[PDB]
């Protein structure tokens, strides 16, 4: 009745699977042609609630980026033509080949001659609903699509790998048709199909094409693995567009295929026919700071409020009562200054380093834990949990290549970010000394195992410390309150001194706030999910002048887009401040005022202007920066002299 090269089926026939395995059904050619038409119809007709076609817009964007990848949201395919979602789950290797051909057809329709830009398209299966942890995978997941959580533990190089390869038989008429290379084994040619016999074989150098390849060791998240167990891992394999989408020491969420293969090594050492396994990745996602044009306009709108700086500073660590100088210093550090280089000759630190020194139970550690959630790139390390190499950088002899390679420490991972060092006073000094270069010269200069190089380490370090003996003692100056020496202390170019003084009207407001915060955080306290989010929003507004979700994107925007300039700053104001601070810092136990503290005033003034999204630094930014630094110096003093110093420096601060 119909041409066998064009026979095609109904959708209910596709639901009525009547081959044995799913793959046997997908590979039936009438079913395959039907599936192609089905997915094409899906891409061209699924829409946003605005009526705008989703994959029309995503394809338009794909071509604009010259990308090889199309992010198909699985939930969309589950909403319409859900049988195809089932086949995609149960049989991804066959389905994705079909869907790739369909996606190339769709974009070739959208852009003529996109075959000239890429000869192929890969669909990326986003938003797959079911998720497994690495401990949770089993035989029943073999060849299934999976979505997995883990941290990338070891990432290899970006090697070429064969994709389509004709082979040469060294007997007879040599060429064999193109085999397709997998992620798992070498091609085998049992016999040459021309002479139908054994022989030697070799890669054909004309008709072979390569794709990018990269294995990654993916391992259980330490905030997930249960107690009393070794963390589990799998070798992820990335191909083509997915290489170097992530870097080690970062969480990822991985959509892929859990595939097994024979390996004589595993059978050999285990003594059973036990197969190796991988996750052939289909898509990789890192796991908030991304923002939209309306969010950009929102940032502009709220920034021109003349009170924005204090609304930000109040928003810093909102459930922490008081401590406004800490929140100021944290705000300054988290926005940072502007890094500079004069004619390429003289590079200057843009980062602002902050030390929180003070008594037990004064929220210093919790402030660091807040910043860990709030910054784009950050890492947190405590005391004897750190080592010098674990902090800056380290080297290891790669078990694959047998060559020595670097591996980044905390201050490499937090490059262009902030690094959080708790219990700074109780690290070993043979670890603390490693901080010096990265903290000021913004670099790490390893020379080890033949490797000799300088890495970039553009970090603001925020550190928390207890004074000598156990708590602060304001009868002493700073140099006797703390074991840290003048060089490292001079690098922390704001100091916060935190004291737990008994004070009835402060303690009652604090205690009331802490109790209110505890009940406001209790677990039991436009559908149901959205309704409790709206109550949550009002609870956040109980204490925060701006949302934290907004603040993080605002920070990331201000950091990455805004570069203030010191246009017409009051030089003599700053110079007299530095001259007087230096003169009063002649006290041999005091905080060592140094040229880097003058730069600190300038960096901080830039950071306040950054909070205003301001191209230019105002007098108000510079006055606030001076006031911050002067207060930091004045409170670093034995109380016998603090009143006199306050009176002397008041001429500079009390103009504002």
């Amino acid at each position: 009745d119909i041409d066998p090269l064009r026979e095609e089926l109904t959708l209910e026939s596709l639901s009525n699977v009547k081959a044995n395995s799913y793959s046997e059904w997908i590979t039936q050619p009438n079913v395959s042609r039907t599936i192609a038409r089905e997915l094409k119809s899906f891409l061209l007709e699924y829409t946003d609630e605005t009526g705008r076609s989703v994959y029309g817009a995503r394809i338009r964007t794909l071509g604009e980026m010259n990308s090889e990848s199309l992010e198909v949201n699985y939930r969309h395919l589950a909403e319409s033509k859900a049988i195809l979602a089932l086949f995609l789950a149960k049989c991804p290797e066959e389905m994705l080949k079909i869907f790739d051909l369909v996606a190339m057809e769709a974009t070739e329709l959208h852009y003529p001659d996109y075959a000239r830009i890429h000869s192929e398209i890969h669909v990326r299966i986003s938003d797959f609903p079911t998720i497994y942890s690495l401990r949770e995978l089993r035989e029943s997941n073999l060849s299934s699509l999976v979505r997995v959580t883990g941290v990338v533990t070891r990432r290899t190089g970006v090697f070429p790998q064969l994709k389509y390869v004709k082979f040469n038989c060294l007997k007879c008429g040599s060429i064999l048709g193109p085999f397709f290379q997998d992620s798992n084994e070498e091609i085998r040619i049992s016999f040459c199909t021309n002479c139908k016999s054994k022989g030697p074989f070799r890669v054909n150098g004309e008709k072979t094409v390569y794709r990018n390849y990269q294995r990654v060791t993916l391992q259980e998240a330490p905030g997930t693995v249960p107690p009393g167990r070794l963390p589990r891992h799998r070798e992820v394999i990335l191909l083509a567009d997915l290489v170097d989408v992530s870097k080690p020491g970062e969480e990822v969420e991985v959509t892929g295929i859990y595939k097994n293969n024979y390996d004589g090594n595993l059978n050999a050492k285990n003594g059973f026919p036990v197969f190796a396994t991988i996750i052939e990745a289909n898509s990789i996602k890192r796991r908030v700071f991304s923002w939209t044009e309306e969010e950009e306009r929102e940032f502009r709108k709220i920034s021109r409020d003349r009170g924005i700086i204090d609304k930000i500073i109040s928003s810093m660590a909102p459930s922490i009562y008081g401590h406004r100088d800490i929140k100021t210093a944290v705000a300054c550090s988290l926005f940072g200054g502007v890094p500079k280089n004069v004619n390429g000759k003289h590079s200057i630190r843009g980062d602002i380093n902050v030390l929180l020194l003070g008594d037990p139970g004064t929220a210093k550690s919790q402030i660091l834990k807040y910043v860990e959630k709030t910054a784009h790139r950050a890492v947190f390390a405590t005391g004897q949990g750190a080592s010098a190499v674990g902090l800056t950088a380290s080297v290891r002899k790669d078990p694959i290549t047998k060559e020595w390679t670097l591996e980044g420490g905390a201050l490499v991972l937090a490059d262009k970010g902030v690094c959080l060092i708790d219990e700074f006073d109780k690290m070993n000094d043979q670890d603390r000394t490693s901080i010096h270069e990265a903290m000021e010269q913004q670099s790490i200069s390893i020379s080890k195992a033949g490797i000799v190089t300088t890495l970039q380490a553009r970090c603001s370090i925020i550190a928390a410390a207890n004074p000598n003996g156990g708590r602060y003692n304001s009868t002493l100056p700073l140099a006797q309150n703390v074991s840290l020496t003048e060089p490292i202390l001079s690098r922390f170019d704001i100091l916060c001194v935190v004291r737990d003084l008994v004070d009835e009207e402060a303690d009652e407001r604090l205690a009331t706030f802490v109790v209110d915060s505890h009940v406001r955080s209790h677990p039991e306290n436009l559908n149901a999910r959205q309704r409790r989010l709206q109550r949550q929003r009002k609870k956040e507004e109980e204490i925060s002048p701006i949302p934290q979700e907004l603040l993080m994107k605002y920070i990331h925007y201000a950091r990455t887009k805004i570069y203030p300039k010191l246009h017409q700053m009051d030089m003599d104001k700053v110079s007299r401040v530095y001259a007087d601070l230096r003169r009063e810092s002649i006290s041999t136990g005091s905080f060592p005022i140094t040229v880097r503290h003058l730069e600190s005033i300038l960096r901080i003034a830039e950071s306040f202007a950054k909070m205003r999204l301001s191209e230019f630094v105002s007098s108000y930014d510079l006055d606030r920066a001076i006031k911050v630094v002067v207060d930091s110096f004045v409170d670093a003093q034995k109380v016998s002299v603090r009143r006199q110093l306050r009176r002397s420096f008041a001429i500079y601060t009390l103009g504002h």
């Binding site: 026979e7 089926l9 109904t10 639901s15 009525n16 081959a19 044995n20 009438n30």
Partner: protein, 665 residues
């Protein structure tokens, strides 16, 4: 070209979607034009696979799962429609698709044979096609407790209601096709693993003979599931009332069903002749005897501990062996030296019918569940008590005609039917006085004997060894029955002269030839011979004259080669062999013919500690025989030391010395 095959498979896939499917508004729902699609699929079978001898459609139809995923749903839902309608009395149309589904089931379950006449494509496709039939058999027996079986009987009942004449040729054919359906569903069985012999064997043989598909276990295919589903669909009731009603167009398929029910089941399994744990303890004690035997044949110390025995022979020469047990037992040393030889004599070797008692391993048994055992034994009981003589008369009165055209399969299945039910009724009547030998009286009616004689005579003349073996079994049961009725008593004397002269000679010639054929062939020869000798003795033309025709050396070779399997034989079989030896050696006293070393070897092996059961009744008979045999061998050697050489050889057919060798003056 294979382009044709993929086009054909695309066509059958499209037809597979045309039949129907589940309706979510789950029930199965027919497609538009569904009757025409079923007819077109029947037409594909005819148009291509039959007319061109291909089986490609029969493969494609299994690939797209039409039988399991459409046809049995159609039949079972139609069964529920008609069942509910019967209680509460456009069926005129839906009846048609039910019938065409039955036609398609009969086609797709149709038995497969491979011969020199089969196309290369057919014999290539044979294995996987058999596997798909096994999946079909599993699904047919399992699905909704096999409700499609009641669908089949209901389709037959809707032409059994009308008059004997009113059943038109189409109605007669429809009933015949229903019988062929039940026959086929019984008949599907795992295929033989058939290997190319051009290329040599590797350093290991075939890794496994298992030819089941992965979604099937052998228990899914076993008789137990057949009995259960046939009982739960009252197929046994349908067959019983059908055979009672016979008063003949369908008679051959109706016989054939009972053959396929009986071909591989042993009658004794239906009779007993903590119980399971008690018998398991008995079994474990029996094999613990073999454990203590091999332990006696095992070193007390580790394998690297071996010193060296030297056997100095009666001559001044020495052999060497490492056996620590042999070091203190020269018997083990001698036999171990013989085991060590790398050389062996090379041995030379040695289809359109199913496996059966004709070719199974002699210890094989169906392990029934007791419910299925009761259901099966009571079904065949009620059949014997109603359907046996009428059916056997109908089909044997057919087979009086057309013997020249009777296909080989048809011959063997008829003979097996005869033998199986005659043997069963004899056994049941030995167990129950309530059961009567007259209930199989049709077996002894003289036309039956004449036909069975014609079958065996023609088969032997044609050298059709398969049908010859079948007729040999049937003759054994005929003689068995004759002996029972001779005791229970006219017709006995009729058959006891009708079997004279050339029939005596023919029966005497099977155990001459039997040594060249399989163990079951030889076993049936021994069984027939024991029956023949007890029959002739019961009568006792001359008794000495007949038994002389048996007591000749190729018969002794056949008995020996049968007895060579002694561990695998059963106690009663060894008893029959040694009763024959008792006759030849003690009674007929032709002792010279058994003074040959093969018997000496075999006697030692079976009397060995690792030979027979110490407690076996057959061991007692062997011991009794061996004592007398050794005494006479000693006596003859004392009288005639030339026999020390003659023991090695066949006896001298040169009479002038042969008489002296035989008797020694």
């Amino acid at each position: 070209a294979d382009f044709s095959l993929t086009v054909l498979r695309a066509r059958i896939a499209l037809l597979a979607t045309a039949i129907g499917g589940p309706d979510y508004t789950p029930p199965y729902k027919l497609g538009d034009d569904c009757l025409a699609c079923l007819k077109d699929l029947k037409r594909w079978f005819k148009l291509v696979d039959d007319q061109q001898k291909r089986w490609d459609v029969a493969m494609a139809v299994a690939e797209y799962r039409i039988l399991t995923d459409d046809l049995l749903p159609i039949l079972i839902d139609w069964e529920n429609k008609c069942s509910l309608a019967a209680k509460l009395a456009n069926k005129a149309y839906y009846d048609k698709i039910a019938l065409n589904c039955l036609q398609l089931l009969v086609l797709m379950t149709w038995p497969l044979i491979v011969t020199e006449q089969s196309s290369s494509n057919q014999i290539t496709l044979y294995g996987e096609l058999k596997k798909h039939q096994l999946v079909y058999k599993k699904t047919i027996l399992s699905m909704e407790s096999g409700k499609v079986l009641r669908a089949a009987i209901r389709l037959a009942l809707d032409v059994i209601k009308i008059d004997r004449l009113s059943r038109t040729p189409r109605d007669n054919m429809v009933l015949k096709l229903v019988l062929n359906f039940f026959r086929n569903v019984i008949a599907i069985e795992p295929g033989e693993f058939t290997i190319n012999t051009k290329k040599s064997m590797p350093k290991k043989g075939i890794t496994s003979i298992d030819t089941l598909p992965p979604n099937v276990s052998m228990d899914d295919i076993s008789l137990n599931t057949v009995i259960s589903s046939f009982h739960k669909n009252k197929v046994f009731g349908f067959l019983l009332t059908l055979t009672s009603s016979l008063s003949d167009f369908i008679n051959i398929p109706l016989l054939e069903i009972m053959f396929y029910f009986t071909k591989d089941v042993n009658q004794e399994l239906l009779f007993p002749r903590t119980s399971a744990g008690f018998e398991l303890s008995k079994l474990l004690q029996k094999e613990h005897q073999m454990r203590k035997n091999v332990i006696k044949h095992t070193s007390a110390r580790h394998s690297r501990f071996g010193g060296l025995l030297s056997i100095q022979t009666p001559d001044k020469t020495r052999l060497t062996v490492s056996g620590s047990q042999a070091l203190v037992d020269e018997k083990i040393a001698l036999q171990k030296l013989d085991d060590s030889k790398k050389w062996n004599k090379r041995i030379i070797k040695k289809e359109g019918l199913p496996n059966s008692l004709l070719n199974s391993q002699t210890g094989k048994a169906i392990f029934f569940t007791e419910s299925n055992g009761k259901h099966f034994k009571e079904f065949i009981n009620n059949f014997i008590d109603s359907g046996f003589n009428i059916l056997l008369h109908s089909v044997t009165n057919y087979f009086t005609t057309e013997q020249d055209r009777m296909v080989t399969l048809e011959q063997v299945e008829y003979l097996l039917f005869f033998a199986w039910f005659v043997k069963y009724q004899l056994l049941r009547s030995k167990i129950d006085n309530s059961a009567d030998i007259k209930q199989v009286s049709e077996a002894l009616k003289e036309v039956t004997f004449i036909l069975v004689s014609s079958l065996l005579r023609s088969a032997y003349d044609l050298k059709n060894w398969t049908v010859t073996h079948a007729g040999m079994i049937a003759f054994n049961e005929l003689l068995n029955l004759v002996s029972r009725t001779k005791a229970a008593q006219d017709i006995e004397f009729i058959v006891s002269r009708l079997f004279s002269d050339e029939r005596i000679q023919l029966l005497s010639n099977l155990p001459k030839i039997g040594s060249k054929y399989s163990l079951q062939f030889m076993k049936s020869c021994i069984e027939l011979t024991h029956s023949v000798l007890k029959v002739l003795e019961q009568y006792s033309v001359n008794f000495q004259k007949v038994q002389a025709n048996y007591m000749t050396e190729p018969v002794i070779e056949t008995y020996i080669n049968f007895l060579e399997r002694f561990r695998e034989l059963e106690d009663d079989s060894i008893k029959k062999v040694f009763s024959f030896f008792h006759r030849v050696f003690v009674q007929a006293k032709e002792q010279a013919l058994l003074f040959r070393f093969d018997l000496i070897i075999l006697l030692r092996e079976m009397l060995s500690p690792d030979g027979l059961d110490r407690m076996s009744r057959s061991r007692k008979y062997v011991s009794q025989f061996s004592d007398y045999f050794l005494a006479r061998l000693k006596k003859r050697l004392k009288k005639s030391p030339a026999w020390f050489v003659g023991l090695l050889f066949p006896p001298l057919h040169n009479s002038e010395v042969g008489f002296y060798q035989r008797y020694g003056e």
